[PDB]
Every structure is written in C-alpha cells, then in structure tokens.
Task: inverse folding
C-alpha cells in the first residue's frame, strides 16, 4: 500500500484483525530506526507508561513532551517527568479561552533519517488497549547532505506546511525541531497536512488552518464530478461541541460548506455523522468506561437535540472493531453507493468549532481555539481520480483505500441515544457487569 494508514492493536480481537495493526512499541522499535531524539505532541500523558514503550536501549535518549496544561495540571505533568532527567517539556500557549492542545504527533529523529507520525491516541495505556485509533506513518526521510542545497519539499508542500505548524507555537524547544526538519528531505510525502492552531485569522492567513484549510485544498487539488450533489459527506468523531440552536448556525452553513467543496468552480448533499450510541458503549470491550473518552455533556446535548437526527451507529465489522470504541476521527467524501471516495482525512479534530474554527467579524475572520492535526489523502496526489474503498480493511490492487468502519453507516434506531458521559445508565449492565454512575 502507498497510504501507510494503520489502526492500533486491539486486545481481544482475533489475530487476523491485528495483522497489519501497530502498537506504540512497534512504532518505537529499532526496526523503524535508531533513535537519537523524539518529540511527543499530545493531550494526556502517563510518563511512566510512555518511557516503558521505548526500547530499553533508547529509554535515555532525549524526549520532548509538547502539552497544553496550565496551573495544577501543569505541575502534575512536571512531577511525572522529574524522575526522568532526559525528558523536557514545552507548554503550548493557549491564549484563547476554552482551547486545548489536542494534536497527537511524534517526531522521531534517527541516525538514518527522520520520521513523522500523526495519530489519534493519547499517551496512556487505555488509549492503545481496546480502542479504534488511527496512525499515519511517514516514510523514512533522509538527511540532506551538508553543502547540498535542495528544498526537500513534496508536491503536497508537506515540509513547508509542517514547519509552518510548528512555527505557530513560538517555542524555543520547537525551533530546534524546525531546524531538524529543514535538514531532511521530505519530498516523498504524498499526504497534505491539515492543522488547527489557536488564533484569529484574516486575509492571507484565513486559508492556513481549520476548515478553511480543508476547503482550500479541496478547491485546488480535487475535481468536481457530475452529480457531486449526490456524494455524501461522512464525519466520524469521539466528541461533540456546542454547535448552536439549529443546523444553519455552523454545522450546515460553514462546516458542511467547506466539506462539500470540490474543484475551482462554484445544499442537498447528505451528511452522515458517526458517533457511538449508549448501546455501542455498553456492549463494547471496555464497557461503560469507554464513555470516559467520549466526553459529550448533557448540558451541551440538551441545547442541540436537532443534531442527533444526523447520528449513525459505530459499526466496524470490516476491521473487526465494532466493539472497540472509536477515538479515531475521520472525515471523507464517498460516492452515492459508497464504493469510492473522493478524499479521506484522519485527524485529532472532533466535531467542534474549537477544533475546526468559526467565522467572526462579518465573515472576515476565522477564530480557532485549539491545536489539532491531521493528514488528507487526495486521489490526485496518487495519480488517481478517486479511491476505491477496500472491502475488508485487512484483506488484500494496493490502490484501494482502507476505510476502517462499515459503509453505508447505519442510522440510530428509535430507541438509541447518543452516548452522553455525565448522566447515569442503570437500566442494563455492561460487558464487565457494571452500571455507569457519574
Ligand atoms: O485526546 C483527546 O482526544 C481527549 C481530549 N479530551 C478528553 C476529555 C476532556 C474533555 C473536556 C475537558 C477535559 C477533558 C475527557 C476524556 C477524554 C478526552 C480525550 O480523549
């Protein structure tokens, strides 16, 4: 395969459903490269656990943890890392209220080159145990010879775009990583970077981030087809923000409008949202505790009951993961019969204005609260007009894209409810025999 899109290993499925999956120990193995230094961008860290995932011979190499924690949470993280003299920390600035550092990325510097890993898992045991999570693995990027002057840039502009993302932090520890990236050849990269960074962007900067970044890439590098209006949009996520009193406020006015962009020319497009029902969580491998990582609050939900008529169950027989609750987030554009897709995005971004941006100041400014990161797969970047959907995620032309859940998505039944994490479920017990009492 040219796509290098993986799922994490799931404890409890048959071996055939983990053949081709990756655990964090696999990613950090010496088979991938001889580690010199690494940077771990994430939201939540268990530092004792994380160091144990590195190979023993690499556990004293420098590690930088890039996080967004403040005040007592910041102190707690520093306390976790103090026993490890080789670990440094970088607090990403969050100057807009209610923002978080959600980006999940590894920079892995080797003797042999550099690797970039953009993924969806927190650095804690539970996120790699029984969840559905996504990983994109970059090629091994070779170093540019000292004295040679080459750009090292890809046709997707990935090198410049990754440097731009890191520059937004304005952090000394990340200037060091920017200099590392400048020294490597990333020309083989076949994905586009889609990032969010906190701020208020107008003018030339409007298209740099968030859903306007996605819109710009789809305008420039995808083609519109006849009957495009019949190609649905699918969004699949693990959390939902406050989207407003009706769909016209944000979901179907600016978010969907960016997502349905194709080509440079100038809505009844079906919108499918995939989000675990209560029954999905109850019967999952983890049981109700899986809902601890699906943080949809009742306060938000009760203000937007209109949204739930868009919701479809989690189903993933194609990858044997129907009972492995999703923490991956994906967005894609399938054909009307779900046999092809016009593009696929894997990202940290949930269905929220904080992650994707919301227009302000009479439509002239995009305000984003959070850091997010994902990679976009476009057929044009692979010499194709569309991707055929792989029918079985782990089965065997390698130009078919491995969609990790079932299509078409299945609408909630009349008795289904979206998982809401801060109310009790006492009607029926989970796979471990327990109820849920927040
Ligand atoms: O990395 C990620 O995707 C995650 C980000 N926030 C999470 C929260 C949370 C939500 C609101 C306020 C504080 C915490 C709770 C449970 C899991 C997550 C989580 O998994």
Result:
């Amino acid at each position: 395969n040219p796509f290098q899109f993986y799922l994490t290993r799931v404890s409890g499925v048959k071996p055939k459903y983990n053949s081709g999956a990756l655990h964090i120990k696999d990613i950090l193995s010496p088979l991938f490269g001889t580690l010199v230094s690494s940077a771990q961008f994430n939201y939540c860290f268990d530092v004792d656990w994380l160091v144990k995932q590195y190979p023993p011979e690499f556990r004293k190499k420098p590690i930088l943890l890039v996080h967004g924690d403040k005040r007592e949470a910041k102190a707690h993280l520093h306390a976790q890392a103090k026993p490890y003299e080789n670990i440094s920390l970088c607090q990403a600035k969050l100057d807009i209220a209610f923002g978080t550092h959600h980006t999940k990325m590894m920079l892995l510097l080797y003797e042999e080159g550099l690797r970039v890993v953009i993924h969806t898992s927190n650095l804690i045991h539970a996120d790699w145990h029984q969840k559905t999570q996504g990983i994109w693995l970059s090629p091994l990027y070779p170093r540019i010879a000292d004295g040679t002057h080459k750009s090292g840039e890809s046709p997707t502009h990935f090198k410049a775009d990754l440097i731009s993302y890191l520059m937004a932090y304005n952090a000394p520890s990340l200037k060091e990583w920017i200099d590392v990236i400048h020294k490597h050849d990333l020309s083989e990269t076949n994905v586009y970077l889609i990032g969010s960074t906190p701020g208020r962007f107008q003018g030339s900067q409007k298209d740099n981030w968030g859903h306007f970044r996605l819109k710009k890439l789809l305008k420039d590098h995808a083609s519109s087809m006849p009957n495009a209006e019949s190609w649905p949009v699918v969004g699949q996520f693990s959390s939902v923000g406050s989207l407003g009193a009706d769909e016209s406020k944000w979901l179907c006015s600016e978010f969907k409008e960016s997502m349905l962009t194709l080509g440079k020319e100038s809505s009844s497009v079906p919108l499918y949202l995939i989000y675990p029902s209560v029954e999905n969580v109850r019967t999952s491998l983890e049981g109700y505790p899986a809902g601890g990582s699906l943080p949809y609050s009742i306060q938000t939900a009760e203000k937007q009951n209109w949204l739930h008529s868009y919701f479809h169950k989690w189903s993933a027989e194609t990858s044997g993961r129907s009972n492995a609750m999703p923490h991956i987030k994906t967005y894609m554009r399938p054909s009307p019969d779900f046999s092809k897709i016009a593009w696929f995005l894997v990202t940290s971004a949930n269905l929220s204005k904080a992650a994707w941006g919301a227009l302000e100041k009479n439509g002239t400014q995009l305000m984003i609260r959070s850091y997010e990161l994902g990679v976009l797969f476009l057929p044009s970047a692979f010499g194709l007009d569309s991707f055929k959907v792989k029918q079985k995620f782990f089965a065997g032309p390698m130009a078919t894209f491995p969609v990790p859940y079932d299509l078409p998505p299945e609408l909630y039944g009349s008795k289904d409810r979206p998982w809401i994490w801060n109310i009790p479920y006492v009607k029926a017990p989970d796979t471990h025999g327990n109820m849920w009492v927040p």
